Amino acid sequence: SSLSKEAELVHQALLARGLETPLRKPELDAETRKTRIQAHMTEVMHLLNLDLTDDSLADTPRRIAKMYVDEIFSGLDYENFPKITLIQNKMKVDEMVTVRDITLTSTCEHHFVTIDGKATVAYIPKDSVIGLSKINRIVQFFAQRPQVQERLTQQILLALQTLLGTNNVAVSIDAVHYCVKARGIRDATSATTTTSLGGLFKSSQNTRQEFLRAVRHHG
Amino acid sequence: SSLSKEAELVHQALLARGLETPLRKPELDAETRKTRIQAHMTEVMHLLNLDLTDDSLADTPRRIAKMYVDEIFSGLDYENFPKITLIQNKMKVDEMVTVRDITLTSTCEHHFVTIDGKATVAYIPKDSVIGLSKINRIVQFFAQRPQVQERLTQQILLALQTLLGTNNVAVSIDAVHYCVKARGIRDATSATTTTSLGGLFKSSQNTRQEFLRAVR
Amino acid sequence: SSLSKEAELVHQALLARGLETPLRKPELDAETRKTRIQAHMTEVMHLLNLDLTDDSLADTPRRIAKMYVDEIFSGLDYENFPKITLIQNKMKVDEMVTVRDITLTSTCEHHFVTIDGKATVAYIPKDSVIGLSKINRIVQFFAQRPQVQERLTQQILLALQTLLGTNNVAVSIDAVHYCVKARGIRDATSATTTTSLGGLFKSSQNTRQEFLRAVR
Amino acid sequence: SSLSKEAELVHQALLARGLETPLRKPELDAETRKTRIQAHMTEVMHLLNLDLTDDSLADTPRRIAKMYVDEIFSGLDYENFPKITLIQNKMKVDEMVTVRDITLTSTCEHHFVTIDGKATVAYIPKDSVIGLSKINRIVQFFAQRPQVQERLTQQILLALQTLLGTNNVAVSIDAVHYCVKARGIRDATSATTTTSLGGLFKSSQNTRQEFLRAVRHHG
Amino acid sequence: SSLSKEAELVHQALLARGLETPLRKPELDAETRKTRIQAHMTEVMHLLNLDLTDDSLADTPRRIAKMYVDEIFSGLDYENFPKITLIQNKMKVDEMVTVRDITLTSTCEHHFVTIDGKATVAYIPKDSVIGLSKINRIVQFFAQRPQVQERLTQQILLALQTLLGTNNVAVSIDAVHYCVKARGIRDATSATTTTSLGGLFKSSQNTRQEFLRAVRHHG
Amino acid sequence: SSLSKEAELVHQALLARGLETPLRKPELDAETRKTRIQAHMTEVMHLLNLDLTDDSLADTPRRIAKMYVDEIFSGLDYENFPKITLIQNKMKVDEMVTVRDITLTSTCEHHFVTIDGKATVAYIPKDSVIGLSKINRIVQFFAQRPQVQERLTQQILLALQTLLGTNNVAVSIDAVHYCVKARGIRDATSATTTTSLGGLFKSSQNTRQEFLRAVR
Amino acid sequence: SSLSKEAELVHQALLARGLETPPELDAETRKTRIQAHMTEVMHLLNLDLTDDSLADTPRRIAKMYVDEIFSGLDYENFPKITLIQNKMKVDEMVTVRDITLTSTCEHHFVTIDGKATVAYIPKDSVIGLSKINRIVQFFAQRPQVQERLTQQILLALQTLLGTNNVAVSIDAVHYCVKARGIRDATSATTTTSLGGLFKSSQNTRQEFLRAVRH
Amino acid sequence: SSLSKEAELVHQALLARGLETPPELDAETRKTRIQAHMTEVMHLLNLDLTDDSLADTPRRIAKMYVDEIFSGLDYENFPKITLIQNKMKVDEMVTVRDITLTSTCEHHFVTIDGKATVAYIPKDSVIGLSKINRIVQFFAQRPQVQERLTQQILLALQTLLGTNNVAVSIDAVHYCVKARGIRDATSATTTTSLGGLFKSSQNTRQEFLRAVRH
Numbered sequence A, D, E: 001s002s003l004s005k006e007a008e009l010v011h012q013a014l015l016a017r018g019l020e021t022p023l024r025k026p027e028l029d030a031e032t033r034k035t036r037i038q039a040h041m042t043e044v045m046h047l048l049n050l051d052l053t054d055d056s057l058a059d060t061p062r063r064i065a066k067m068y069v070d071e072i073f074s075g076l077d078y079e080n081f082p083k084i085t086l087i088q089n090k091m092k093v094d095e096m097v098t099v100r101d102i103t104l105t106s107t108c109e110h111h112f113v114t115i116d117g118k119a120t121v122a123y124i125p126k127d128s129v130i131g132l133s134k135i136n137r138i139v140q141f142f143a144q145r146p147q148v149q150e151r152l153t154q155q156i157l158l159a160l161q162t163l164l165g166t167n168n169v170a171v172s173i174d175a176v177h178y179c180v181k182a183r184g185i186r187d188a189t190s191a192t193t194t195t196s197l198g199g200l201f202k203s204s205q206n207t208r209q210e211f212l213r214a215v216r217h218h219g
Numbered sequence B, C, F: 001s002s003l004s005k006e007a008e009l010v011h012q013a014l015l016a017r018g019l020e021t022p023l024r025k026p027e028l029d030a031e032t033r034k035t036r037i038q039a040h041m042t043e044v045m046h047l048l049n050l051d052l053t054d055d056s057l058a059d060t061p062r063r064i065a066k067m068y069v070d071e072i073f074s075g076l077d078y079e080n081f082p083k084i085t086l087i088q089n090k091m092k093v094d095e096m097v098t099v100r101d102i103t104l105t106s107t108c109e110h111h112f113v114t115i116d117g118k119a120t121v122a123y124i125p126k127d128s129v130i131g132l133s134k135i136n137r138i139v140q141f142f143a144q145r146p147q148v149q150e151r152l153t154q155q156i157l158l159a160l161q162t163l164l165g166t167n168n169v170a171v172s173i174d175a176v177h178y179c180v181k182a183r184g185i186r187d188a189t190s191a192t193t194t195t196s197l198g199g200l201f202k203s204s205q206n207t208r209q210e211f212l213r214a215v216r
Numbered sequence G, H: 001s002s003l004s005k006e007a008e009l010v011h012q013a014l015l016a017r018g019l020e021t022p023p024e025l026d027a028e029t030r031k032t033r034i035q036a037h038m039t040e041v042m043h044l045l046n047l048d049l050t051d052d053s054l055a056d057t058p059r060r061i062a063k064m065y066v067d068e069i070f071s072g073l074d075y076e077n078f079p080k081i082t083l084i085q086n087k088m089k090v091d092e093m094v095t096v097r098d099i100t101l102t103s104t105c106e107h108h109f110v111t112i113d114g115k116a117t118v119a120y121i122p123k124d125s126v127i128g129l130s131k132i133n134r135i136v137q138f139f140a141q142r143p144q145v146q147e148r149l150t151q152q153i154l155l156a157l158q159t160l161l162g163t164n165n166v167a168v169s170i171d172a173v174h175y176c177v178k179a180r181g182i183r184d185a186t187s188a189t190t191t192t193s194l195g196g197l198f199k200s201s202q203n204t205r206q207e208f209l210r211a212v213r214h
Ligand SMILES: Nc1nc2c(ncn2[C@@H]2O[C@H](COP(=O)(O)OP(=O)(O)OP(=O)(O)O)[C@@H](O)[C@H]2O)c(=O)[nH]1
Pocket: A083, A084, A085, A129, A130, A131, A132, A133, A134, A137
């Protein structure tokens, strides 16, 4: 109810597709949820046998709680959705616009550790041309959630289709998963690329290959 | 019976294809096999005229035995098959997922020396999406065997098809073989690429080209 | 008593220096600590308003518990100290030995997020020469703790001095901190280098410069 | 007794320094030792449960035996020591000559797996200037042994000092150890550098730093 | 007659194709031809006004003779053909196997100076899979001749098609010719690429482009 | 006699130092010597079992003979020495002038096989500043002989000092020897660096390290 | 009448196509007169030609024009061509890349610095490699326009090789653009001329063009 | 008499040091006469000046000499200098690197292409950054010898900044060497002029020089 019309359009579009991140309605406010998380992380640290009396560690549970609710999972709250600016396509662009090497930082939902990546996004403007920076903001909004890279790519795609009023959008993400790099198999070199293509990017081999060939060069 | 359902499924698929690594059924436990290999490697080092009274060398046979059975050849034992986790394709991905630059280390079965490479794997999820690290674990499981790169590539492919429940998988491996680089011709610059393509990666030229172009 | 002689020697050296990681003595076994952490992480995820009925998410608390206790923080337990092997310096090396580009992954103790870096270690062997992989194992042991990079560097240094029986050791670490890159200021380009120098690496300007120049 | 005077000078110099690789006198000939090693590796392969009836594996024990005695450990036999060619230093070079990025392949003596590296060698000619290629040959000769990188560097240094008739030699080796990379800790990125410096390279800070600064750039 | 079956099969195929290096039958053993080449090269040095009494220069004619007959032109003698080892294609590979960046050193037949390059070879196994090192060996065999680059490429192709029992082979070479760089026009930058494509690699546009596109990352 | 004064100064200075390429006076003219060299190379090719009726090989003896006398060994004839222009150091430069990455192609005198290198030259002008291209020309002159790298470097050094009227000259050559790469050991990676330093470049440690650090 | 047979074939080819670069005195006299003119110019730039560094500049310039950088105007300077039979029956393109190319802006008389890439499919004959480099530099040593230079190299090779299957690409920095006027320090210009199969056959055309970029 | 105070200080400085580049007609007339001379040269190269591409080349050249590439001979073209007080009390070197530099060989009149690196330690004043680039290019737009050009930039900056603590390094490719004569396609030339502490103080000197290389 306190959401922008843009935020609301995108959330409902995600829900109707089955794509929304698995959520429940909060019944505690954010300040209280921060506090309760802090208490729980305090115990965790005790259960790791850490000495919380040390000046360096004493504030860690508070820092973590803050980080979870306000920082890295801020994209779970649609009040944080970016404000959307659109201008008319008076200049009548009908070739793709591409924003590449977008900084993306997320968190894998199976181990709660860092995902570090880059997104590349393109679209063919129909009636509206979006403010460039809103593209980076939308990618970062969906990334500030516990994620599976596959779902993250689909979410950013559907959101952009919805705001731009066109199906002709493509999203590609290339990322290092620290769940892979820093534990378990500990593969120091691998990276994962996922792609979600809509409209002509999916179905027009020249549009599709133009997009895909362009990604290949950087990651 | 002692193997996971996944591991037994992969092994039987490899066997029906003729792709399983040349194996005989085990008659001795892993620990006595280790003990005996240690015995044989002792004589080998004697026969090389090396002095085993050297502190540096004294334990090498035991180290080697331990390495063969427990590490570089641990993929000969399906009890070491990775645990497999799959989530539902509820997000409905229908474009390829590509894990590139997978660290791979193996052993050439003709000379028993190091193979050093990188794998790239892609699949189009059907009903399931695999945990990403499981792709790196599967590649390394098959790599921890005496191998011919051509067979290694096919085994990884078929194992992944079996577990993902789809033929839409592709595997590419690029590797330096030390049996080419460190002896014989001693080619210090060359490397070998092999590729195994399934379903659309083999037959669908847009999907096939998309994967092959990405590798390069 | 349950720890190796090496591990106990390192721990007591760290303790006498004031360098040990802030620890309390264990009152609960590792397995019940895991069980309990799993309980707390369940509530955390509830408090984030996440839906744990999702197949993808359902097991995350258990995965996290398991990760903290058994993997990324396993260096809090000296039973996991690496086995140490030393051979006699019979070859009489008296110039530095340098292992560079050691893979290092840690966790910042202020935000509990990933630290990703590379260590470079050098020493001048006195009576003993260490097995090379043991240098990478020691770096990673200390890294698998909640850490402040400045403390991590000093702990690696002192542990190596203790085991090598010489003060002539140097440690340098270069790392990206995700608590700087992935939240707060979100500096995507920066990195931090810390360096701890012992014996001649600190005081001898030719030895000191030789190491520092090599790092760059 | 069937050794060149060069080979004999170097072997005795190594022995008197305590640096020779740990060896015993053979009492079987090489052809017989190959055969006996083949028999033992055949058992090893059986103990790995491998099927030796397969065309690909049947010849592996023979290949391995051959590789050990004639290929990778050929440097254990001083009849394989390279022939040494020297010309007078009529041109009176008194500045270092440096051969860098010498291909080096060896085998670590603790696990019997590949070492892959590059050596850099320099010396200040006194009376004699060596044929360039003999430098690479000497490095490769000592490398074709089970090795510890520390001992390998010292061996190549003393050998060159002995043949060149001067102490002013330096050796640096930078190498990837597959005992580290492909088993155990499995560190995909690290590398080890060792240095052995004689004469002015050890003791003259300008000669020493000129050598060391020059290595730094490539590895 | 004294050749291996593989060497004879390949030599006859090249002769029936019209592709063999222009050879005559040797009336003199190799040792005698070295001795005579040494005599001729001794005279060439005299004719260059060089002082053969110089310690550095005295053995040069013998070194050159040994080099021509036993080293850089050893591929003129099919007794030096590689041993070929093949295993059954039981694993049923039916895609391209590619060995890239094979070290190749040869000699231009027009000026007898160094060619330095890299080969890339691919094949689709039919019934057999060749030992990888034999591909490098086969490339170097043909390279150890006075060559024209475009002939060298064709000969490697036919040799490989002959041993492997399939037309589906491709060879590509990229090389610097010192008869271009070190004399005449003295072009420091240029290089030459030649391509020989058989069976599917010539005829099947996807197979052909998969090969050619993969080479492009040669240089 | 038929030389430029410069050619004669350099030749004489190299003769006194003992640095000349081992030569003796010619009894035949260049044209006769080319004809005779073509006859010897004709026979060598015949003795290699090559078939001279082939159009592509037929002219090879004549090409080689031409290449030896007039091209790759043209630096043996001091009539081929570059013309030397100098302007006055009116600008009063007193810091090294460095020409780097000079193209150098030469022949190994032990095997008669290509050497491919780069030179770096620097000098501190005294009375004269040399035409920049003349430095490239001097390097290629001495390189168009059968050489050993150590001698070549000393020759270019003294030749420059004698023409510039100052000892303050430095020469560094970095080269790949095909006698190492294409035959014998066949090391595809290695390269050789030689340096010759005169005047301040040898003794003055700031001038010395300035030149050396710049070569890298 | 004093040219080689090849140099005549080429020159007639270019004339007939309309593709030649747009003779009373001998080479020696034209130098003396150029040198006289360049003297006045330096006077007109207020330079002091008594300076030792400067004194000999007019003759250097004259010599550079006639004998060096515009030596390609003289077909007596055309390279010698050697062909061998295509006995080896090569029927795939042969490509020489990164050919060193240096030339002059015909509009401002300023340095052009580039690289050429040339490919052909041998029909009956296989040209010596280094002659490809020589033909490129022959045409480059003229005042040029990059578009014309590329077309000239293409027709000449086609003529000498007895096949239309030849392709030429040149990538170059013009100091007319970098050192003067707009002073764009980063830009470069690519031109391509494609003949026979390189123009018409999409796989031959794409193989060439894909190769250039990579 | 028509120059700025700074341009006069610099010109006198260079004259007094012996470091100036070695005036009857106005700029407009010298162009017309240069243009007339370049016409005859093209005639003497046997070029057809009726060609549209070629027709206007003589005037382009004249204009390029007087107004563009040799515009540095005219101190009326000397850049404007703005200094601010060193209120911030910087006493460590300030370095501008990779300054775009384009010039001409005074010996063959051929393009020089380089980069300069300049450092100084501000004493009383801090120059606007872009004026450092402008001073470098002012001296470069003359027929030059690299060794002289570097010394000129150094004295000029010293004069304008009121400190001897200035250092100049230039790294450049001369087309006199690359496109002509020996045709060395890979070589480049570095020259350095060091003043005050940059010459005398080994740590200041090494800090500058170490910085250039890296
Ligand atoms: N489409 C397009 N957008 C541009 C271009 N240059 C800037 N923009 C965008 O124009 C938008 C500005 O509109 P507003 O939303 O009012 O800007 P803002 O309020 O400051 O919001 P933010 O930029 O996100 O911080 C930004 O989002 C820019 O990315 C451009 O060249 N093309």
